[PDB]
Amino acid sequence: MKISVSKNDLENALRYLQAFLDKKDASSIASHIHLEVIKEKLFLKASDSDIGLKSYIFTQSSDKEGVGTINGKKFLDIISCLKDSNIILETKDDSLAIKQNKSSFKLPMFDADEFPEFPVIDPKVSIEVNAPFLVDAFKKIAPVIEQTSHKRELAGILMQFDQKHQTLSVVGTDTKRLSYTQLEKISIHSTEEDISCILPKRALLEILKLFYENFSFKSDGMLAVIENEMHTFFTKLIDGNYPDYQKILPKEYISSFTLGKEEFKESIKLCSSLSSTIKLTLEKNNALFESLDSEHSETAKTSVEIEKGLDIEKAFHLGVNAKFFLEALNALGTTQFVLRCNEPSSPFLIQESLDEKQSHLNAKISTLMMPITL
Amino acid sequence: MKISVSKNDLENALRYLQAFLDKKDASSIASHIHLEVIKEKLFLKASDSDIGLKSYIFTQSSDKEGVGTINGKKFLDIISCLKDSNIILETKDDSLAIKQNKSSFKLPMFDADEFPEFPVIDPKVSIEVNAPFLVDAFKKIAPVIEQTSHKRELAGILMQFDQKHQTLSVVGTDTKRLSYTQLEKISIHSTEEDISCILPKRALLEILKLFYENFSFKSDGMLAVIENEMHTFFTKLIDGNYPDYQKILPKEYISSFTLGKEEFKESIKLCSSLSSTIKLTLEKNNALFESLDSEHSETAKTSVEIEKGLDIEKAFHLGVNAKFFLEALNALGTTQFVLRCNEPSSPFLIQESLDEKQSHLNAKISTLMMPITL
């Protein structure tokens, strides 16, 4: 091959690709990016059986078309050390030459025939995402999912597509808490009325780096493929049978309290200076927070006034996990939140104020958590 | 005790003290700060046989004088979670109560009688530092000193005081490189005409966090004590007999080249994308840099034009350690540097352009390095 490219364009493409390389063993083609010049475009890809990214940039000049490979980490280290002028890339034999003015480099290429084939699917379901609601949901739900979850299907996020009712439900859970959202009025094309894709957490995190809005999401039940103008990303899906969250959501809630989000964040952070768990006491015009989990003779307490009185006769006590409660509040875009409760020994809900109100750009995440006893 | 203090004042004092606590075992008094209220001042200290800091802040109100202790990490975690209003601190029995409005905390105190005594010295040497030259020297020399240097006295920085000639020499070395500076016109008070203090690296690093200028430095040959208005710091010294750097500095240099600092930094960083060592070739109007240490079939090269010709007939080749060379340049405040050379197999010097010129505020650091062969 022989081309010249913009330094910035190349650098940016290389940064995105770093996360799809096994960088530790440079002698393996898994540490390499595959390169292919084609009619005024350079395509860069890094792939394996589980995950991959294909990107392109435009060439500033193109002289000779072809394919090749190069160590992705070294390539990026080199480029990030160069000036902002254009970079000439040119193969020699099984070596890639890189030149910019007085600076020149060589790196070994591998046999491109060993490079994994970049899959293509024939999609069973597909959507066009024209707003940030989906990545908004991914971002807000991701904290509840542990990547090394020793149970296979909880290690990922669930995308449940309802062709019939044009809804996409997004769910994450570890076993102590569960966060979900139901996205309405989503134009779903699908061969079946119901289908569920489980994205590995690792894939979820890469998706957040690559995509925001104006992308397509397609899947054949085995791989999910996401594309916009510059990128094609894919991931293997996790086998199947995500627990149905709908069955373990409580039917009713005796108590629903509208409370101050930032005051609760501040008060919970404060008590977690000495504990992981907190005792919350709600009264008509007052919220009290006490460290619960703290070591002997270490105590942390605070309270906040509640101006618009709660519908409480005397006092409601609820033991909570401080981090989970904070992360539940972190996931909300409202200044106030609703806490829904029943018995203090039973799971409780945290959601946005006016969660029922419909929006378009953003997702509204609800979180169900198990309480701590006493 | 019973006092109130400014939240910011307290927080800042606590941050400085964190580094003088063994934080991992909270059950040990080594994790605690000692507190003592005295006539409108609160003193906070953390100390051991080797190192310590004593600080104070003014009290906003004082009601009851006394002493006590508290876990430094927990104390800071609590305070950093509070609002900016004043904080009431008040003992109860062997517990410290902390209150700010609706927020209140308790932490256990230990028997203050176990707390290490904060040393005082009768100083054999003393200086007043009214400019940043000393910490400037510390900062520039610190990178060449390895803290876990398995040789005892190279693990610290040397302060050599010449009462006679009113000079303080500061030196650091690992065995491959040595950096030094001679500070002139320093008002030294001392019982002897010559004395040397070796500061442990750990102490050096804390000093950089605490002090800049307008402080005193005193020592009794065993401890060094540094004080300004707010702080008294001390460290144990390292036993003695720092190798005399003066004997291994070359007498003369055949070649002295004035070169571009930033161009050399850029060119060296560039080649170190693929190597730790670089082959430098100086010609009359050109500097060439080639990766030396790089793996087979990985090459990095660049050059820069030298407008004001060097006094070279054909070409001078010098193998260098890239990091050491960069750190040598990092230590210089000039846009140009001088490289002094002799034989390519013999140690060479890097110093500021016009190193001989005298300054007041800043230190001028020179670095002697051993070359790499071929």
Author numbering:
A (entry chain A), B (entry chain A): 2 to 375
Show passages lifted from the paper.
The sliding clamp is a ring-shaped protein complex that encircles DNA with the help of clamp loader in an ATP-dependent manner, and slides along the DNA. In prokaryotes, however, β-clamp is a homodimer, with each monomer consisting of three globular domains, and in this way β-clamp displays a six-domain ring. Although β-clamp is part of the DNA polymerase III holoenzyme, it is not attached to polymerase III permanently like the other subunits. β-clamp is loaded on the DNA, by clamp loader, a subunit of DNA Pol III.
In the space group C2, one monomer was observed in each asymmetric unit, which interacts with another monomer from asymmetric unit to form a dimer. However there is no significant difference observed between these two structures from different space groups, the structural alignment of both yielded an RMSD of 0.15 Å. While Hpβ-clamp was found to exist as both a monomer and dimer in the crystal, the dimer was the dominant component in solution according to a gel filtration experiment. The dimeric ring shaped structure is a biological functional unit that binds to DNA and slides along the DNA. The β-sheets along with loops were found to form the outer surface of the ring. The N-terminal region of Hpβ-clamp was found to have more electropositive residues and the C-terminal region more electronegative residues at the dimeric interface. Although superposition revealed the overall structure of Hpβ-clamp to be similar to the β-clamp structures in other organisms, but some important differences are there at the regions involved in DNA binding. In domain II, the loop containing residues 210–214 was observed to be shorter in Hpβ-clamp than in E. coli and the other homologs. Moreover, in E. coli and the other homologs, the B-factor for this region was found to be quite high, compared to that for the other regions in the protein, in contrast to the case in H. pylori. These results indicate that this loop in other organism may interact with DNA, however this shortened loop in H. pylori may not be involved in DNA interactions because of the absence of certain residues.
